[PDB]
């Protein structure tokens, strides 16, 4: 149903698959993420990161 996103290095790929497994994850496929061009290294996500830094600042200023 809902997309879940996991990262690790390839070394604990097996150790991960089993634990995920025991909790009820399904259709577990290891990827990279180049096969989903928007949700890969590009300018686009880096701009989103800036957008969150602005968010952080706005919350702090309002709480003050």
């Amino acid at each position: 149903m809902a997309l879940v996103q996991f990262y690790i290095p390839q070394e604990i790929s097996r150790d991960s698959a089993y634990t995920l497994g025991q909790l009820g994850l399904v259709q577990f496929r290891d990827l990279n993420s180049k096969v989903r061009a928007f949700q890969r290294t590009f300018v686009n996500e880096i701009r989103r990161l800036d957008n969150v830094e602005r968010q952080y600042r706005y919350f702090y200023s309002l709480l003050k």
Binding site: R29, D30, L31, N32, K34, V35, A37
Partner: protein
């Protein structure tokens, strides 16, 4: 088939890129085409104007 499947998925991505790239070459050409068939559209309209002129 996990370590057969990624390799297939990498190939699919490279393929998705080449089909979209053929269209973009096509588009440039489509623009060039518009100027050529409009070059032909003037000298066929020119002979049309000489038509109703010579008729006059």
């Amino acid at each position: 088939s996990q370590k057969n499947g990624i390799a297939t998925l990498l190939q699919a991505e490279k393929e998705a890129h080449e089909i979209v790239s053929k269209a973009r070459k096509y588009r440039q050409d489509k623009l060039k085409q518009a100027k050529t068939d409009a070059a032909k559209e003037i000298d066929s309209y020119k002979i049309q104007k000489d038509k109703e002129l010579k008729e006059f």
